[PDB]
RNA sequence: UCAUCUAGACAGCCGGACGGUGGCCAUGGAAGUCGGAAUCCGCUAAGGAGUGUGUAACAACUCACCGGCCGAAUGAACUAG
RNA sequence: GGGCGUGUGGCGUAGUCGAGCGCGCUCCCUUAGCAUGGGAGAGGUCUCCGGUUCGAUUCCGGACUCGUCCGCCA
């Protein structure tokens, strides 16, 4: 156990992201398009897979 | 950092050994420190030491103990670190640690607690009731290495005052008894040691070592406190009634007779106190078990069990006196067991064995336990013959033979019969004549000062010169 | 105690260490836990010497030790011999042995009073053992095992021998050594008991994989309680 | 209400990260001590599946072991049992229609 | 060597390539060992994997007892007979190639070793040093 | 091509987001939110017989709607260089 | 290598979405031989595992699998 607030603060940077389906890039959670050129700024995004 | 609540313990409302609001118990499953208390510890370093102590591997535990000791050594810097919360947690862990298989863990834990008492004197008063019984149990542990240092440290802690050490026995006697009860009655071999990591044996071995320490403590408590029997009778009865103390009286299996010896001492002490006479059931249970032990001694284990045999016989003689040999009456086959025991015992003689045998005879003669002529003499004669064939072989030989003669001579005196007199003379001559080098060992000759009138011995010397 | 120790992963402590009543010898290339076991258990009363014998980390199989004397092979250098002479107390005698078998811990199984040797040792080496160690010597094999030092662990109180040993050989060796002997295993069933562990009057050190019945057999036969 | 307390008690031990075997030994010890919660719990626990079996008196007499998921609320666990009943009833109704034709 | 190594080993001049037959020094009933592989050997085109003293090899019993023949087992080289240099600069060699049988962890299948063994092997394998008569 | 727009639009904060009514069937329960149908009034500046989270069912939170600040364009879908 | 088919009792072998026979032998009875017959026996995870079904050899998917067939150059 870390602490509940400290787990929230660490998960803000480590777990509450989104993943581009084409190029696996770690993206902002409210993003609409990937920031990478190689996937062509696609809008195929998924949430980052949580535990539990 | 630490999570979870001991909800079950709250329902239980039993503090076990602890009187400070924390359950303290020897068994692994319960009495573990509460997580909230662990969070409350003053420093991160303390928390880490505790986590390591909880972990099963010994090397990790030893390192943690070493770290804790280092922190205590620098007390002035770390006085802030040690707080009631630390003491409550330590008390719960210390109990588990003292039962540890590894000696180093046991020794270090004892040293650490003593240091805490010296350094935090007068602030550990609340916790003295929890700590003192455990410290004492360590000082009364069969292994010399754990016990001697621990006692020396304790004496030093109390400024080398004998009175203080004795006072401790008196002040916490009720608590000391509670610890004994917990080991003897509350615990079982399984509870003390995890089954997965231990065999059926070993688990038994461990329990027995711990229980032996409890008995040694009980004997010490009785000696130190004269009025213990009256004040704590109910508690004493429950500890005594349980068969666990008595199960220790088995010589068929087991590494040492030291534990068995401790039980014998307890029975003797109880008889001297009169508790055994006072409570018949406890006495009968003890006596029957002792008789069973006599059967256990066998030719295969005679060498191993030989030191304990003089002691066993001596206790029996004392018990026989009670109730006019009432002890033999309890068991229908007791006489047979004794006869068998004697036959096995005679083959291997240990120092002091003969004196015990005579003592038994002295108690038994008034009530005619053994026929003097049909039964006893054969035992004596065979014994001398055996002694002669393989006498010098051993060292104690001179002492052992001396003993036989002194004892046999007394036995012979109460005969008023020709056969006994004849046997004495013939055996004496044989013992001296085949001999070995009886004259040469001056001590042996001195110890065996004489067996007959002076002039006759001279006549026999005369025959040897006169012989072909 | 039979103390659980490893030599960097090795569960054979008799190979890398030699323990007597008066001194202890440990290899120079050892871990902190391995040194800390001997330092904590032995205490400050008994010197512990970090030594190398003949340029080798193995010292227990190279040397045969006693409270009165220490025997070293011919290949031991003058620097190692002088370091042992300075570090050891004045009571013990250190003498080089000039003998073909040259691995004295494997060759010789010895205690304070009586010793068992390899049958084929030279007579000068036997007299050298009897002189320096002050110990009476028998040439005997343990059920056909010529390496009595590797296949027996011996102390004053008792002895542990090879597990596959004839019972007649057990009472013969027990009567010859005047100590009780038990056939048993060490380090989760390893046959080499003398290489497996070291023992003296009050301490035994064994590998971590030595199981609890084996450790109980050790403390029972060596009377360490 | 009693069931919820039982669930909380088991959970606290799990949170500590205590060995599952040790936890069970503890339950047994508590039963000897007469802890009420301890008495309710059956000795074998399917911790791997997070299921605890708790004996419940038929009438506030005989106690029937009931599987409870630690994660779900006590009420929720009960609904799952109710759901099984509902599914069984639906199956039975379909079977009734099937039987007449099947027999022919 | 590899897994069961107790420490490292300085480079000894390689004397036993693949296909070499060495004497079987222990009392396991095997007479010779035939080397088919060397543990830890590198890869080069046309180069035979060669063994030195103290190395662990894979070997078959070509001559010996039938329950030891016709299978592969690990072995440890204890006598080399090709001269090699130590860091004190003596060039030394035995008069025959010899090895013992072991498991992959390194403990000996046999119980006693006949003849000398090298100290570079005895330091690296403790069971070999345990059952070894003379270490040079 | 649809919509909104100085009579205050879209983002961002803040407040309300209600009664008839736990609308009718159906379920051991399901009260806006397991489903089937209907989907209407009042008070309104405004609030769906409910957008989700949500409980055994509740309770609770949030929505799309209206309001203060902002003062001017903005939202959705689609087409092709 | 690939493709394709296959699989039932201790053995063999018949099977509609509703596991049978024969044999080895379990027992009992039988007979002028150059010795048999009769009557009751046991025995399946239908290769295996899922889904479907109302249940599945029987329906379907996966795996196993044994048998088949086809595959280089100068
Ligand atoms: Mg090539
Ligand atoms: Zn992308």
Domain holding C128: CATH number? 3.75.10.10
Tell me how crowded residue E3 is: count the other CB atoms within 10 A of its CB: 10
- The CA–C1' separation of A12 and F71, in angstroms, is 36
Contact present, A47 and A20 (Cβ < 8 Å): no
Q: Name residue, tokens 């596959």.
A: C164
Which bases of strand G have any atom within 7 Å of the beta carbon of a protein residue? 18, 54-55
Cα–Cα distance between B417 and B428 in angstroms, integer? 17
Method underlying the structure: cryo-EM
Contact present, E39 and E57 (Cβ < 8 Å): yes
Cα–Cα distance between D72 and D80 in angstroms, integer? 10
Q: Which residues of D touch B8 (CB under 8 A)?
A: 9, 12-13, 26-27, 30, 35, 37-38
Q: D17: which residues sit within 8 A by CB, 6+ positions away?
A: B3, B4
Cα–Cα distance between B256 and B303 in angstroms, integer? 12
Look at strands E134-135 and E116-117 and give their pairing: parallel
Structure tokens at E15: 């004397």
* DSSP code at position D41: B
DSSP SS3 for D83:
helix
**DSSP E strands: which ranges in E1-136?**
21-24, 32-38, 56-63, 72-79, 84-85, 91-92, 98-101, 116-117, 134-135
Q: Which residues of D touch B1 (CB under 8 A)?
A: none
Rg for chain C (alpha carbons), in Å? 16
Q: How many CA atoms lie within 13 A of D72 on its CB side?
A: 15
- The CA–C1' separation of A30 and F65, in angstroms, is 25
Whose atoms come closest to the Cα of E48: which ligand? 1
Mind spelling out the 3-state secondary structure of chain B?
A: CCCCCCHHHHHHCCCECCCCCCCECCCCCCCCCCHHHHHCCCCHHHHHHHHHHHCCCHHHHHHHHHHHHHHHHCHHHHCCCCCHHHHHHHHHHHHHHHCCCCHHHHHHHHHHHHHHHHHCCCCCHHHHHHHHHHHHHHHCCCCHHHHHHHHHHHHHHCCCCHHHHHHHHHHCHHHHHHHHHHHHHHCCHHHHCCCCCCCHHHHHHHHHHHHHHHHHHHHHHHHHCCCHHHHCHHHHHHHHHCHHHHHCCCCCCCCCCHHHHHHHHHHHHHHHHCHHHHCHHHHHHHHHHHHHHHHHCCCCCHHHHCCHHHHHHHHHHHHHHHHHCHHHHHCCCHHHHHHHHHHHHHHCCCCCHHHHHHHHHHHHHHCCCCCHHHHHHHHHHHHHHHHHHCCCCCCCHHHHHHHHHHHHHHHHHCCCCHHHHHHHHHHHHHHHHHCCCCCCCHHHHHHCCCCCCHHHHHHHHHHHHHCC
Tell me how crowded residue B94 is: count the other CB atoms within 10 A of its CB: 22
- The CA–C1' separation of B312 and F14, in angstroms, is 93
Tell me how crowded residue C155 is: count the other CB atoms within 10 A of its CB: 24
Chain B: residues touching A (Cβ < 8 Å): 1-3
Cα–Cα distance between B461 and C56 in angstroms, integer? 69
8 Å CB contact of B202 and C216: yes
* DSSP code at position D31: H
Whose atoms come closest to the Cα of A43: which ligand? 2
Strand partners, C206: C4
* DSSP code at position E54: T
Q: Which residues of A touch B1 (CB under 8 A)?
A: 1
Instruction: Identify the CATH class of E15-136.
Output: mainly beta
Cα–Cα distance between B28 and B194 in angstroms, integer? 8
Resolution (A): 2.6
Tell me how crowded residue C131 is: count the other CB atoms within 10 A of its CB: 12
Return the closest-CA partner of residue C217 out of B350, B312, E127, B199: B199
**D27 phi/psi in degrees, rounded to 5:** -60, -40
Contact present, C3 and C198 (Cβ < 8 Å): no
Cα C127 versus chain centre, distance: 20
Mind spelling out the 3-state secondary structure of C67-111?
A: CCEEEECCCCCHHHHHHHHHHCCCCCEEEECCCCCCCHHHHCEEC
Q: Which residues of A touch B2 (CB under 8 A)?
A: 1
Cα–Cα distance between E42 and E2 in angstroms, integer? 12
Q: Name residue, tokens 């863990």.
A: B105
8 Å CB contact of B256 and C225: yes
Look at strands C136-139 and C114-117 and give their pairing: parallel
Cα distance from A12 to chain B (closest Cα, Å)? 20
Q: Mutual orientation of helices B173-181 and B233-241 as an angle, nearest 10°?
A: 20
Cα distance from A11 to chain B (closest Cα, Å)? 17
Nearest nucleic acid nucleotide to D104, CA to C1' distance: G18
Q: Name residue, tokens 């088995």.
A: B250
**In B, residues 196-215, which contact D (CB 8 Å cutoff)?**
196
Structure tokens at B183: 């080991």
Cα–Cα distance between B260 and C85 in angstroms, integer? 47
Look at strands C109-110 and C198-199 and give their pairing: unpaired
DSSP SS3 for E24:
strand
Q: D60: which residues sit within 8 A by CB, 6+ positions away?
A: none
Q: Chains A, B: CB contacts under 8 A, how many?
A: 3
**DSSP E strands: which ranges in E53-131?**
56-63, 72-79, 84-85, 91-92, 98-101, 116-117
Tell me how crowded residue B436 is: count the other CB atoms within 10 A of its CB: 16
- The CA–C1' separation of D83 and F28, in angstroms, is 9
**A23 phi/psi in degrees, rounded to 5:** -125, 10
- The CA–C1' separation of A30 and F13, in angstroms, is 19
Cα–Cα distance between B407 and B403 in angstroms, integer? 6
Contact present, B404 and B448 (Cβ < 8 Å): no
Tally of domains in chain C: 1
Q: A50: which residues sit within 8 A by CB, 6+ positions away?
A: A15
D98 touches strand G (CB under 7 A): yes
Of B145, B199, B303, the CB nearest to C213: B199
**D66 phi/psi in degrees, rounded to 5:** -125, 130
Nearest nucleic acid nucleotide to D81, CA to C1' distance: F28
**In E, residues 88-117, which contact C (CB 8 Å cutoff)?**
88, 107, 111-112
- The CA–C1' separation of E71 and G11, in angstroms, is 37
Helix (H) or strand (E) holding C24: strand C24-27
Q: Which domain holds residue C147?
A: 1-225
Q: How many CA atoms lie within 13 A of B319 on its CB side?
A: 27
* DSSP code at position C190: B
Cα distance from A20 to chain B (closest Cα, Å)? 35
Size (chain B), residues: 468
- Best residue in E130, E131, E132, E135 to probe C by mutation, most C CBs within 10 Å? E130
Cα distance from D2 to chain B (closest Cα, Å)? 13
Domain boundaries, chain E: 15-136
8 Å CB contact of E126 and C9: no
Structure tokens at C79: 């620097």
Look at strands A26-27 and C198-199 and give their pairing: unpaired
| Gapped junctions in chain B, after residues (C–N > 2.5 Å) | none
Q: B292: which residues sit within 8 A by CB, 6+ positions away?
A: B249, B337
* D16 φψ region: left (φ > 0), alpha (ψ -120 to 50), beta (else): alpha
Q: Which chains, if any, share at least 3 CB pairs under 8 A with chain B?
A: A, C, D
8 Å CB contact of C101 and E126: no
Cα–Cα distance between B122 and B136 in angstroms, integer? 19
Go through B168-201 and write b for each residue having 16 or more CB atoms within 10 A of its CB, e for each that does not. Answer: bbeebbebbbbbbbbbbebbebbbbbbeeebeee
Q: Name residue, tokens 């911790």.
A: D47
Strand partners, D83: none
Tell me how crowded residue B350 is: count the other CB atoms within 10 A of its CB: 19
Return the closest-CA partner of residue C193 out of C132, C157, C142: C142
Strand partners, C137: C115
Tell me how crowded residue D47 is: count the other CB atoms within 10 A of its CB: 16
Look at strands A26-27 and C153-154 and give their pairing: unpaired
Return the closest-CA partner of residue C147 out of C119, C174, C123: C119
8 Å CB contact of B4 and D25: no
Structure tokens at A32: 């609409």
Cα–Cα distance between B107 and B151 in angstroms, integer? 11
Question: Chains D, C in contact: 3+ Cβ pairs under 8 A?
Answer: no
């Amino acid at each position: 156990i870390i602490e509940p607030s400290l787990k929230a603060l660490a998960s803000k940077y480590n777990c509450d992201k989104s993943v581009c389906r084409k190029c696996y890039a770690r993206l902002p959670p409210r993003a609409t398009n990937c920031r990478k050129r190689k996937c062509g700024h696609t809008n195929q995004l998924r949430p980052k897979k949580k535990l539990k | 950092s630490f999570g979870g609540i001991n909800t079950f313990q709250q329902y239980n409302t039993d503090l076990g050994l602890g009187h400070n609001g924390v359950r303290i118990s020897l068994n692994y499953f319960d009495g573990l420190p509460d997580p909230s208390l662990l969070n409350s510890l003053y420093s991160n370093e303390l928390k880490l030491i505790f986590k390591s102590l909880l972990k099963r591997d010994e090397t990790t535990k030893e390192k943690a103990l070493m770290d804790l000791s280092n922190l205590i050594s620098d007390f002035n810097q770390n006085e802030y670190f040690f707080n009631d919360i630390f003491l409550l947690c330590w008390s719960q862990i210390y109990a588990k640690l003292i039962i540890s298989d590894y000696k180093v863990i046991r020794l270090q834990s004892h040293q650490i607690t003593i240091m805490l008492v010296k350094s935090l004197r007068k602030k550990i008063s609340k916790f003295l009731k929890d700590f003192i019984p455990l410290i004492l149990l360590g000082t009364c542990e069969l292994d010399y290495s754990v016990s001697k240092p621990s006692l020396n440290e304790l004496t030093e802690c109390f400024n080398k005052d004998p009175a203080k050490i004795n006072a401790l026995w008196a002040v916490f006697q009720e608590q000391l008894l509670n610890l004994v009860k917990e080991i003897v009655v509350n615990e079982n071999e399984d509870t003390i040691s995890d089954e997965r990591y231990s065999s059926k044996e070993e688990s038994e071995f461990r329990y027995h070592r711990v229980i032996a320490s409890a008995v040694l403590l009980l004997i010490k408590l009785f000696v130190h406190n004269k009025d213990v029997s009256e004040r704590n009778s109910s508690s004493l009865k429950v500890i005594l009634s349980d068969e666990s103390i008595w199960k220790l009286l088995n010589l068929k299996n087991g590494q040492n007779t030291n534990a068995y010896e401790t039980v014998l001492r307890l029975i003797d002490v109880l008889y001297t106190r009169g508790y055994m006479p006072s409570h018949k059931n406890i006495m009968k249970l003890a006596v029957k078990k002792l008789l069973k032990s006599l059967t256990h001694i066998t030719s295969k284990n005679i060498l191993k069990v030989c030191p304990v045999l003089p002691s066993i016989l001596n206790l029996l003689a004392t018990l026989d006196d009670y109730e006019d040999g009432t002890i033999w009456s309890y068991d229908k086959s007791s006489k047979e067991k004794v006869l068998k025991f004697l036959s096995v015992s005679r083959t291997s003689p240990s120092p002091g064995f003969f004196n015990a045998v005579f003592a038994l005879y002295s108690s038994t003669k008034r009530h005619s336990f053994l026929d003097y002529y049909l039964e006893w003499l054969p035992f004596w004669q065979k014994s001398v013959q055996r002694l002669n064939e393989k006498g010098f072989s051993a060292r104690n030989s001179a002492e052992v033979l001396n003993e036989f003669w002194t004892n046999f001579l007394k036995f012979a005196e109460d005969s008023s019969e020709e056969r006994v007199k004849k046997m004495v003379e013939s055996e004496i001559f044989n013992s001296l004549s085949c001999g070995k080098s009886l004259s040469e060992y001056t001590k042996l000759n001195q110890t065996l000062s004489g067996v007959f009138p002076p002039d006759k011995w001279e006549r026999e010397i005369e025959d040897y010169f006169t012989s072909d | 105690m039979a103390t659980r120790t490893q030599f960097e992963n090795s569960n054979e402590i008799g190979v890398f260490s030699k323990l007597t009543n008066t001194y202890c010898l440990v290899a120079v290339g050892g871990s902190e836990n391995f040194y800390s076991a001997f330092e904590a258990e032995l205490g400050d009363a008994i010197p512990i010497v970090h030594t190398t014998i003949a340029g080798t980390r193995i010292i227990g199989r190279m040397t045969a030790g006693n409270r009165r004397g220490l025997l070293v092979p011919t290949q031991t250098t003058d620097q190692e011999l002088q370091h042992l002479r300075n570090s050891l107390p004045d009571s013990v005698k250190i003498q080089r042995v000039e003998e073909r078998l040259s691995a004295l811990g494997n060759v010789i199984c010895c205690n304070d009073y009586v010793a068992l040797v390899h049958p084929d040792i030279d007579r000068e080496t036997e007299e050298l053992i009897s002189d320096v160690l002050g110990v009476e010597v028998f040439r005997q094999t343990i059920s056909g095992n010529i390496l009595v030092g590797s296949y027996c662990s011996l102390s004053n109180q008792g002895g542990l021998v090879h597990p596959q040993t004839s019972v007649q050989d057990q009472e013969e060796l027990s009567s010859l050594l005047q100590v009780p002997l038990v056939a048993g295993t060490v380090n989760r069933g390893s046959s080499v008991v003398g290489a497996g562990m070291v023992v003296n009057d009050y301490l035994a050190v064994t590998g971590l994989d030595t199981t609890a019945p084996e450790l109980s057999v050790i403390e029972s036969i060596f009377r360490l309680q | 209400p009693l069931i919820e307390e039982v669930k909380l008690a088991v959970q606290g031990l799990i949170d500590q990260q205590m060995d599952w075997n040790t936890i069970e030994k503890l339950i047994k010890s508590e039963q000897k001590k007469g802890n009420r919660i301890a008495q309710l719990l059956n000795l074998p626990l399917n911790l791997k599946q997070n299921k605890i079996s708790v004996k419940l008196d038929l009438s506030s007499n005989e106690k029937i072991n009931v599987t409870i998921d630690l994660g779900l609320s006590a009420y929720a666990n009960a609904t799952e049992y109710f759901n099984i009943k509902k599914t069984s009833a639906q199956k039975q109704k379909k079977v009734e229609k099937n039987v007449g034709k099947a027999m022919k | 060597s590899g897994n069961g190594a107790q420490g490292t080993k300085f480079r000894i001049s390689l004397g036993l390539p693949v296909g070499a037959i060495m004497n079987c020094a222990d009392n396991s009933g095997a007479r010779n060992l035939y080397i088919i592989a060397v543990k830890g050997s590198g890869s080069r085109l046309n180069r035979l994997p060669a063994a030195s003293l103290g190395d662990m090899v894979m070997a078959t019993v070509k001559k010996g007892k039938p329950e030891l023949r016709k299978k592969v087992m690990p072995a440890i080289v204890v006598r080399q007979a090709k001269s090699w240099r130590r860091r004190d600069g003596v060039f030394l060699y035995f008069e025959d190639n010899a090895g013992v049988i072991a498991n992959p962890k390194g403990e000996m299948k046999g119980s006693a070793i006949t003849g000398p063994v090298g100290k570079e092997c005895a330091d690296l394998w403790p069971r070999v040093a345990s059952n070894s008569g003379v270490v040079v």
